[model samples]
Target: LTFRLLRESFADAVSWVAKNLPARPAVPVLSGVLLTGSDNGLTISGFDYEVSAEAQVGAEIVSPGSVLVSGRLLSDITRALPNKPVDVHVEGNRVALTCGNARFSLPTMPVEDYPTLPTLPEETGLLPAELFAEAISQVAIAAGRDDTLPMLTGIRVEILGETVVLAATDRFRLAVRELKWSASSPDIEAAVLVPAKTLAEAAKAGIGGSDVRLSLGTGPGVGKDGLLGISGNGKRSTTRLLDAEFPKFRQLLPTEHTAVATMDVAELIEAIKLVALVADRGAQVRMEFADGSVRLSAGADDVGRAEEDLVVDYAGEPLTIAFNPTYLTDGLSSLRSERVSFGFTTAGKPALLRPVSGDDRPVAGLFPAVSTDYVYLLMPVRL
Candidate 1:
């Protein structure tokens, strides 16, 4: 094998392909990157059965061939090399890598031993990259990382025609984002529970492209029936959908609120942080809304406590509610708005939080790609 790739492209492509590399590979070959050089360009990819990542970059191919090398080690060497073209060639039992004055000879593995990469399913839909990226973060933030409770670790993807809703919940809170995309069919509908972190990484990696391609595949790759492939910007990623049931989350969406409070998002976030410092283990940040203001307080009298007050845009029956500090801040920080509205039905019922506009109403998103048709429902810690 003989090939030449620009330093920047080589380094960047290595990271892209190694983004999902297994930390503790079940098989030793899974730790290596499959390097394939051909007339088209250079293809670098790696797979760990569950998730696969690939990157395509332009290269000067002297003799087209394929080889495998430690991806993490190559990733470390490529990024550290001086700015110059990288020359790679296989020398019997070793792979020689050179860039400027630096030189390193690495051992190669049997390419034939590597498992065949799963083929991506035909394109199912196309979505604006920026909107899809933001929507993933907004909704994925609510997905729990508890592997024991695997049921809540996935982001429920519900699609009907051009409308695709990403919903995630961690028992304490739920986040939903409605998005529009270009689908292959107008009447086709499908639903899948995707691993949230994997989907988020895929979304983050494809933000460089204008459009992201989605291919819902169920192939003979690892015996998994459901696989989601996301490709864009000369890169691609695939992950198997979780085989767990996502509860009837739609029924949890709040319909109306008796008490609503409009306040500066930054103020509430900061107040929550202040009160959270004094909150004891398993305690919640408590808020009292009355007299046109909101009071935040937390902690037991025997120990330390904290309190703060902020004038609020509120009316109607006053109410008091308690919320998990981390959960409240997580939802608030996800909003891309200066003002936020809090909708409460009762102290015991879950509350709704929405981004507010000039008219103090919840409007679509600030970006053309993302419409702010998002709502975060948080369950209050009943006191």
Candidate 2:
């Protein structure tokens, strides 16, 4: 293979493709990035069994061919090169890279041994890139990191017509975000559990583009096939869906609340941070609400204690509840609006948090009652 490309373009493509390369690949070839040069341009790709990433860049092809090299090494070398034209050519057993005064030779891997990349599924619809990225961020914060509990490590994607709902839970808390998108079919109804880490990465990468194209296959009920493809901004990524079944999260959302409180998100976040300093492991941040104000307190007798009060718009009888400080902060930080509404049924039951707005126009179904552009449910700690 031979190609001449601008240093910035080559570096950008290598960096993007290398992000998905597994550090401990099952096979040697899986660690290599496949480089293909043709009259059309240059394509750089990397794939482990589960995920694949590809980036295309404009290049002057001297000879149309292909080669494979270490994805990590190539990324490091390209990113450190000076701003100049890059010339690459394959020799008998190695690939040589030259840019400005720097030169390096890397042994080629057996490209024939690399597994064929899975083809992207049929395009299902389009989504506004910024909106999709924001929604993913809000929901993925609650996804579990423990691989042993694989089902909780993914975000459940529920699609119905133009509405897309992303839901994630880690047992302690559940986050749900509802958004609208352009769908190919108005009758489309599908649900797939996607790895939160992969979905977050795809959303971040697509943020620079105008829109993201979502593609998938129709699967049977809960045990359906699990492949999802996302493409945008001259890049594409595909990931296999997690096989474990996601929990029935919809039923977990409470339909009624005995008390409601609206508070400024910024104030609540800062106050929690201050009070949390006194809380240790398994500790709870306690909140007592009545009339026009709420009081927060934390810590035990063995450690220092903290107390702070803030005026809030509240209703219903007096109520008291406690929650894990970390979980409380995670839910509060995810709200985008200036004010956040907290609904409570009792001190022991899960408390719901949603964004509050001045515009009180009721939405449809569960959306209007809970103010559900996004909803975060936190199971209160016993106090």
Best-performing candidate as measured by lDDT: 2
lDDT on C-alpha atoms for all candidate structures: 0.82, 0.85
C-alpha RMSD of candidate 2 = 2.3
Compute each candidate's TM-score over C-alphas: 0.92, 0.94
In candidate 2, what are the lDDT values of residues 125-167, reduced to their tens digit? Answer: 7898999899999999999876799989999998876888899
- Lowest-lDDT window of 10 residues in candidate 1? 361-370
Candidate 1 versus truth, CA RMSD in Å, comes to: 4.2
Best by TM-score: 2
Report model 2's TM-score to 2 decimal places.
0.94
* lDDT string, candidate 1, 77-134, tens digits: 8999999999999998799999999999999989999987887876667798999889
lDDT (Cα) of model 1: 0.82
